[PDB]
Enzyme design. Structure first.
Site, PDB file in Angstrom:
ATOM      1  N   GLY A  18       0.824  -1.191   0.000  1.00 14.70           N
ATOM      2  CA  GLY A  18       0.000   0.000   0.000  1.00 14.70           C
ATOM      3  C   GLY A  18       0.861   1.243   0.000  1.00 14.70           C
ATOM      4  N   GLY A  20       0.715   5.918   0.617  1.00 14.03           N
ATOM      5  CA  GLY A  20      -0.015   7.112   0.992  1.00 14.03           C
ATOM      6  C   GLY A  20       0.939   8.285   1.055  1.00 14.03           C
ATOM      7  N   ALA A  21       0.519   9.358   1.715  1.00  7.61           N
ATOM      8  CA  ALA A  21       1.366  10.533   1.865  1.00  7.61           C
ATOM      9  C   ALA A  21       2.605  10.202   2.691  1.00  7.61           C
ATOM     10  CB  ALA A  21       0.580  11.660   2.530  1.00  7.61           C
ATOM     11  N   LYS A  44       8.594  -0.276   5.379  1.00 10.20           N
ATOM     12  CA  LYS A  44       7.974   1.029   5.209  1.00 10.20           C
ATOM     13  C   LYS A  44       9.034   2.032   4.781  1.00 10.20           C
ATOM     14  CE  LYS A  44       6.263   2.913   8.906  1.00 10.20           C
ATOM     15  NZ  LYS A  44       5.332   3.260  10.020  1.00 10.20           N
ATOM     16  N   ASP A 132      -4.312   9.110  15.436  1.00 11.63           N
ATOM     17  CA  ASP A 132      -4.784   8.666  14.129  1.00 11.63           C
ATOM     18  C   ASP A 132      -5.419   7.278  14.196  1.00 11.63           C
ATOM     19  OD1 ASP A 132      -3.204   8.326  10.832  1.00 11.63           O
ATOM     20  OD2 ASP A 132      -5.232   8.940  11.393  1.00 11.63           O
ATOM     21  N   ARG A 136      -8.550   1.653   9.483  1.00  8.57           N
ATOM     22  CA  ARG A 136      -7.516   1.555   8.452  1.00  8.57           C
ATOM     23  C   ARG A 136      -6.119   1.423   9.058  1.00  8.57           C
ATOM     24  NH1 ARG A 136      -9.361   6.854   8.580  1.00  8.57           N
ATOM     25  NH2 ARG A 136      -7.777   8.318   9.357  1.00  8.57           N
ATOM     26  N   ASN A 137      -5.961   1.849  10.311  1.00  4.82           N
ATOM     27  CA  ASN A 137      -4.657   1.831  10.973  1.00  4.82           C
ATOM     28  C   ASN A 137      -4.548   0.725  12.018  1.00  4.82           C
ATOM     29  OD1 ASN A 137      -4.585   5.443  10.772  1.00  4.82           O
ATOM     30  ND2 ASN A 137      -3.646   3.915   9.421  1.00  4.82           N
ATOM     31  N   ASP A 150       1.191   3.001  13.256  1.00  6.19           N
ATOM     32  CA  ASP A 150       1.329   4.457  13.265  1.00  6.19           C
ATOM     33  C   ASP A 150       2.028   4.870  11.973  1.00  6.19           C
ATOM     34  OD1 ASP A 150       1.904   7.224  14.099  1.00  6.19           O
ATOM     35  OD2 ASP A 150       3.901   6.503  14.630  1.00  6.19           O
TER      36      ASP A 150
END
Ligand SMILES: *CCC(=O)N[C@@H]1CN(c2nc(Nc3cnn(C)c3)c3ncn(C(C)C)c3n2)C[C@H]1F
Length: 280
Positions: A18, A20-21, A44, A132, A136-137, A150
């Site tokens: 996946g 993202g930003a 990551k 957050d 989704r997390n 995180d």
């Protein structure tokens, strides 16, 4: 748990999981030099601080050791920062409940609520405000075992800090406590609000909160006293826990330790608290 410093030659990326930003997460394989053991991992790669600053942030990150929080296993510093973390084979819990909504029973849902509360209680003990929390997390290790992670918003509170006062970063409005939206203030108790929204996501099998409503209108709706609706499968006892998480006074909200106790009780007689056809 300690921080390992990895060379690029120690691990390889297999495919994208996946993005993202924050950057990109890859499924990967890690083989520590000379250890001959192959470890499945999630890599990551983040999208500059001094190397020593980054390593110090990683040392604290690697010290986070709980069954329901994803652990940092190692770090590689080159042109980019790469965090080697525990791989969660089944992906995010949001997608999982959407995919398997027809086959998920009350025992699993309530167990997930307990586990998420345990992970958050651990973060609170570490003086970490997550900021957050959302389905989704939360990631799925096995159908029976989930872990929080995180992607940069978590903050460590100093000994005398009771809240984190945020700056200009972009915010997940529909998961945020009212005081966070209005005043940029975050506490363990605003995390409890987000926990409530996360539970609502799970109990609606991954439905969208305040669906179709502009984020800019959310504070006004909350100020009028409106909240997310009772999910079809929820008895009122479970919904009332959610509602307690969204009370305007942060101090009147349950703490994670209390949420562990309450959901653990419900998890002992699951069908008494969630009504699901074919369960069982
Ligand atoms: C619903 C949120 C989402 O899709 N987020 C993506 C995935 N992601 C992520 N994914 C996995 N594992 C995985 C397995 N199959 N899929 C489809 C994803 C992770 N394992 C470990 N982590 C972190 C601790 C780095 C994972 N993160 C985050 C985002 F890219």
């Amino acid at each position: 748990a300690l921080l390992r410093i990895l060379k690029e030659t120690e691990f390889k990326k297999i495919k994208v999981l996946g993005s993202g930003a924050f950057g990109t997460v890859y499924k990967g394989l890690w083989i520590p030099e000379g250890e001959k053991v192959k470890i499945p991992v999630a890599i990551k790669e983040l999208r500059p601080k001094a190397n020593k600053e980054i390593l110090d942030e990683a040392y604290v990150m690697a010290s986070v050791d709980n069954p329901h929080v994803c652990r940092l296993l190692g770090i590689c510093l080159t042109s980019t920062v790469q965090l080697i973390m525990q791989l969660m084979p089944f992906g995010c819990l949001l997608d999982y409940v959407r995919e398997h909504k027809d086959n998920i029973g009350s025992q699993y849902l309530l167990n997930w609520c307990v586990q998420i509360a345990k992970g958050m209680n651990y973060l609170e003990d570490r003086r970490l405000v997550h900021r957050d929390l959302a389905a989704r997390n939360v990631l799925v290790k096995t159908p029976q075992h989930v872990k929080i992670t995180d992607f940069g918003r978590a903050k460590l509170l100093g000994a005398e800090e009771k809240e984190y006062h945020a700056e200009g970063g972009k915010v997940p409005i529909k998961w945020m406590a009212l005081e966070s939206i209005l005043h940029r203030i975050y506490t363990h108790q605003s995390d409890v609000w987000s926990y409530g929204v996360t539970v609502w996501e799970l109990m609606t099998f991954g439905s969208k909160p305040y669906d179709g409503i502009p984020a800019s209108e959310i504070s006004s709706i909350l100020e009028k006293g409106e909240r997310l609706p009772q999910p079809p499968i929820c008895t009122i006892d479970v919904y009332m826990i959610m509602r307690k998480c969204w009370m305007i006074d942060a101090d009147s909200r349950p703490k994670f330790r209390e949420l562990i106790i309450e959901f653990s009780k419900m998890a002992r007689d699951p069908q008494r608290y969630l009504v699901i056809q074919g369960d069982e």
